[PDB]
């Protein structure tokens, strides 16, 4: 026999200004529904969630965890599914809200897929990364031993809700950091988007993107992931643009733990790259210093003492294996282009390496 | 956004006798492949499947499991995923092979949908179970604390190979649970099926399945359950005729462990619901009569001492949550054919049950 069956999965990526008074949380809900927390964002958006919900007539039990990179791990997966055990999540009809960062909805949207096989969720971002990155896609996971999302799902929250208003309590650090993913998707598909950057970059940061321009800019990061990730939503085609920024730093984030953010490891990769399109003539001598100079003007590090040439070419095996055999580089053609290549040589590597040590 | 996308799962489901000259184990695989097999298999078919592989030209590791119900948890799916890591099994140009029971291959396919987050595996079931329902499906998962395939995914293999030649050497006991299986399917959809069995139902534990009747029965089975998942197959309409017979038995195999195979406890969930249909006038009490007795005739029991009014009831509550607050219970109208019903009540379990202990 052959069996063929069609999934047609659809969900919604909202902009939700003011999101905790009338507009919808309340009936992105519906009542009484579990929701996991990151312990940072409950004491800080604690008082006013629960205010919402009680006034607006819903009934909850709060699952606080707290989250970091190090114990993103299955074993916190096991934490929100006892959670949900506990609280008799009903197969569909009652969704569990993620309300955190990309640690926190990554862990519960796995624990959501597993749930039963899938159970739904709902996705608010409280972090740069999460409003443009980790909380619109359809990708879950967790590390497992040394190895960065090595175990997880596809599995879109069935509604994203992005409030830009969380990015006010971020420090100057985690805003970054998230712009640095804005900055991938810029770099390899949107001159005008690495334009606003450049322009505007130091004042995001200073107004944690609180109100323009840091709007287009987040409306321009989102249709740019969204365009990459809709029509390749289970990667079949494993020649991905937004694989920018992603060859290294999986290998590079895990070996510095805790010291590198996500978004910073990202970073690393993508000066690496940048430089190895350079020295290929791919970008001008003057492209390749507007790229390294919009980082240094986002106080995003180029290089890391855990980049030694043994741990790039460790980094770089470990992702043909995940690319199927390829290495599938985006390296930038320009800005705001790029080009797919697979004679990346060990060679080349360092000597990108130690371009950028005198550049740093 | 609205973000849509479309994903064709298809897979094959081929019978295939002798497996382990000239017949595709081969080519099922094209080279070098991780295998992952059952402990008492290893032990029964390794001889013969390392020579298979070895004059077809393959290299390999064996990654050994020794597969029972209370093992059926994350870890063991953890030591499947250690041998992914350590073997160095690619994104997708190299399918990994699970060879063994439903234990085994619902482990295996779980570990490799979460793998990279899906990974290709192939499925050799070689018990009856495996053949004619978990390895023939899409649904994989393990168990969570005291509850049933908690955890888990829609996974199919790419492809089943079925070879009834191995089920030569199961006991009876294992040759009637797997029986059980493939009359929950004739009871609800295949009359002709159920008479097939009634007919011939002790020769074929006695032959083990061997050889033309055990052949048509394994074919209607097959072709019985295919029917049901393909247009279904991640379970939105959540009336399903193959829940017949899983509605009590979850945690009833779960408080009997490790007394109760999966198809003896589904067998006294079929008998129990026979009994209530028969007490609501969906079946006579000849037909009750021939359902009981094709279930004594296989050794099949139809109560056990788990089996109280207070567990019957939790059993029915865990699975009105699971089908997301309705029972949606199909109860056998007549033989070879079934209805949903919503209204079960306490009351009827409880008279069924005495039903039950006077004819057991
Ligand atoms: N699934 C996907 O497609 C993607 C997943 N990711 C994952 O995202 C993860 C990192 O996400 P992040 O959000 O950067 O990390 P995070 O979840 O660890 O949060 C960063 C920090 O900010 C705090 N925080 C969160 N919201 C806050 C707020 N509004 N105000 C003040 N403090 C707040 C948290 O408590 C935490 O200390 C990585 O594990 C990365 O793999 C990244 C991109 C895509
Ligand atoms: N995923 C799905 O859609 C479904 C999954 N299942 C799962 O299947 C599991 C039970 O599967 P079973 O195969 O009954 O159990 P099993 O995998 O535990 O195997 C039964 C026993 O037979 C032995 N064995 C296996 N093949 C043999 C052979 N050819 N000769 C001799 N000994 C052999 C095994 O070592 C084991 O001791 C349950 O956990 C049930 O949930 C059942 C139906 C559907
Ligand atoms: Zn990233
Ligand atoms: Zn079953």
Chains 1, 2 share one sequence.
Not at 79 to 97: I, K, N, S, T, Y
């Amino acid at each position: 026999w052959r069996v063929s069956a069609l999934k047609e999965v659809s969900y919604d990526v909202v902009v939700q200004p003011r999101l905790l008074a009338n507009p919808a949380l309340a009936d992105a809900l519906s009542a009484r529904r579990l929701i996991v927390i990151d312990a940072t964002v409950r004491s800080l958006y604690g008082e006013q969630l629960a205010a919402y919900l009680a006034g607006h007539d819903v009934e909850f039990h709060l699952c606080v965890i707290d989250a970091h990179e190090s114990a993103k791990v299955m074993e916190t997966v096991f934490e929100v599914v006892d959670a949900m055990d506990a609280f008799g999540v009903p197969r569909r009809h009652a969704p569990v809200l993620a309300m955190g960062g990309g640690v926190l909805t990554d862990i519960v949207g796995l624990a959501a897929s597993l749930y039963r096989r899938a159970t739904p969720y709902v996705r608010i971002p409280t972090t740069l990364i999460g409003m443009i990155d980790a909380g619109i896609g359809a990708k879950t996971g967790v590390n497992f031993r040394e190895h960065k999302n090595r175990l997880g799902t596809y599995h879109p929250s069935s509604l994203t809700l992005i409030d830009p208003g969380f990015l006010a309590t971020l420090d100057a650090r985690h805003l970054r950091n998230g712009l640095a993913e804005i900055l991938k998707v810029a770099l390899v598909k949107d001159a005008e988007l690495f334009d606003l950057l450049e322009g505007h970059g130091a004042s995001l940061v200073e107004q944690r993107m609180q109100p323009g321009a840091a709007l287009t800019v987040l409306r321009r990061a989102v249709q740019g992931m969204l365009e990459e990730l809709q029509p390749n939503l289970w990667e079949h085609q494993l020649r991905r643009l937004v694989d920018f920024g992603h060859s290294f730093s999986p290998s590079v984030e895990m070996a510095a733990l805790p010291e590198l953010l996500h978004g910073e490891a990202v970073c690393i990769d993508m000066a690496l790259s940048s430089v190895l399109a350079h020295h290929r003539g791919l970008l001008t001598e003057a492209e390749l210093g507007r790229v390294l100079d919009v980082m240094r003007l986002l106080h995003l590090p180029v290089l890391h003492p855990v980049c030694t040439p043994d741990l790039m070419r460790a980094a770089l095996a470990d992702t043909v294996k995940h690319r199927d055999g390829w290495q599938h580089m985006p390296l930038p053609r320009g800005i705001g282009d790029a080009v797919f290549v697979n004679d990346v040589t060990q060679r080349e590597i360092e000597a990108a390496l130690l371009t950028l040590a005198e550049r740093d």
